[PDB]
Amino acid sequence: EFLHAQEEVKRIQSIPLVIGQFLEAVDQNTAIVGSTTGSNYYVRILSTIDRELLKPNASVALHKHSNALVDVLPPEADSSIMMLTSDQKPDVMYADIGGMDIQKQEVREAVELPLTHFELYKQIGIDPPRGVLMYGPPG
Amino acid sequence: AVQKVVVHPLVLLSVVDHFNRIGKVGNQKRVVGVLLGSWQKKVLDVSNSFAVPFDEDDKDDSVWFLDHDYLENMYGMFKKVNARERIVGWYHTGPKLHKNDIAINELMKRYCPNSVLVIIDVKPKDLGLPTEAYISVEEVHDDGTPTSKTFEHVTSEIGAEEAEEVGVEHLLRDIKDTTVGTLSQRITNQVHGLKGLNSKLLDIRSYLEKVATGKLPINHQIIYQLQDVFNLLPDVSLQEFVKAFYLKTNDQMVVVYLASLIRSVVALHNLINNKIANRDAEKKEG
């Protein structure tokens, strides 16, 4: 009998689905989200959601009227998608840049050297840099 | 050529209701009609159908008629309401392969290239799937007739669809052997499966009925597969079957041992989670 009710509840996650973003929960299985409409709400949630899939800053799904949690989402951003890598390389060689021996090697140390050789920074523990600024005259 | 067919519950009932609506004839009428649908990615599909007016006399049972005007107007209405939907073949109600069902296909093959027929069941009982589809093949061959043509059965199954499953599971409401765990396969194929092998053992016994008494043609094209079965009966128990068999059983039971080894400890932890819910509730509440 119970398994008739079990899959029965998921009709609300039909298709007219609006998007919020998870913020926190008061307790177990009742929470607070931040809508893409700009306002925030105290909402309820579907029980079958693995709650441990929540909170990087979770893209969640809201019912359009009853305004409660529906579904957890894979991430999305509508900026430069990801630099599509085929027709996206600005075909500039390192040899195209002449006369930047210090700074090109130095930024190589700062960016992709901890990317690959991470466990030297980890093992010696020299705190690889979080972000990097570069400036100067234009051109 | 044609891999298999896709049959829907909508066409499945959409024959049976017509057998009901001509069920008032009492005496004899086969439900023959026009089978509609597509075939894509070398997969046959059956989506819509209707039935044609048909009569038949037992004397001179080589005479059939399809009102092809009724075939044109209603299928024009069907292409009109649905340009996606088209013809896919035909069907007859198929108790036992009636005899006009050699040319019904040759009568209306001018519409569909692989003008497929479908035998259905009117009184549903078997230990399998009572849905049949043939296909037309012809032969200028071997020894039966210089004009020879016999249907060959393509494998047949009931195609499901997300649209129709709401109506299917809605209109079941009776019983459904879900909770697919350690015993779904046991009953859908290990209980039902060996009895599946029962009838397949029985059908070669039904062919064995001609040792000296049955029909007059003897074998020709039966016995290569028959010799192939007993030729290809599997290997006997003398080598590593029992060895490597004991090896791999002897490895699978390790994993079983670990799983049972965890499960008890889990439920024990759960009982400790109950005794905290007992001992510090009896003094607190009373």
Binding site: - | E56, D57, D60, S62, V63, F65, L66, D69
Partner: protein, 191 residues
């Protein structure tokens, strides 16, 4: 008007293959079918005229329709060639008339025979008493050439209008390639 439906059974047999009557047999009996279906059409707008044959392959060349453009289109380069099989002509003439839009119609069939028949008279008296059990009046009009003083047909029409049938006729073929309009001017005048 009166309820019937005309189902003409053309003769596409291999003995219907000369230019004996005027133009051709094909245009002669074809335009015979055209003027009698204009007769049945203008006498009653409900009647539909389709053509079946009694050949080796009794094809529904045209579906039973009140339109005649399919009849005129298919009867051009129709190739009326084949082995005649009249023993299935009775059932292929009858079961279509049970396939029709109304069994309330008068079951009326014209039949064209212009070939030597190899039926059994026992078989067509079984089918003839079958048509006694089915209450069907068929007026057979003979074309072409045939076994003269048409053999097995007088007994078939006689065993068709028997048991108070008494309304059917057998227009026999004259063995002269005349103009065939006056050959069929009597069935268009009286039954």
């Amino acid at each position: 008007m009166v309820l019937e439906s005309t189902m003409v059974c053309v003769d596409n047999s291999e003995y219907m293959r000369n230019g004996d009557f005027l133009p051709t047999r094909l245009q002669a009996q074809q335009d015979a079918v055209n003027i009698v279906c204009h007769s049945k059409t203008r006498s009653n707008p409900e009647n539909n005229v389709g053509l079946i044959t009694l050949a080796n392959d009794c094809e529904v060349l045209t579906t039973l329709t009140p339109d005649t453009g399919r009849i005129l289109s298919k009867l051009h380069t129709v190739q009326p060639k084949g082995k005649i099989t009249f023993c299935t002509g009775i059932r292929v003439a009858h079961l279509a008339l049970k396939h029709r839009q109304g069994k309330n119609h008068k079951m009326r069939i014209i039949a064209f025979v212009g070939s030597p028949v190899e039926d059994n008279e026992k078989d067509l008296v079984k089918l003839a008493k079958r048509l006694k059990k089915e209450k069907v009046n068929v007026d057979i009009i003979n074309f072409g050439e045939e076994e003269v003083n048409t053999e097995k047909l007088t007994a078939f029409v006689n065993t068709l209008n028997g048991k108070d049938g008494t309304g059917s006729h057998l227009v026999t073929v004259p063995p002269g390639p005349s103009l065939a309009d006056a050959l069929i001017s009597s069935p268009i005048l009286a039954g």
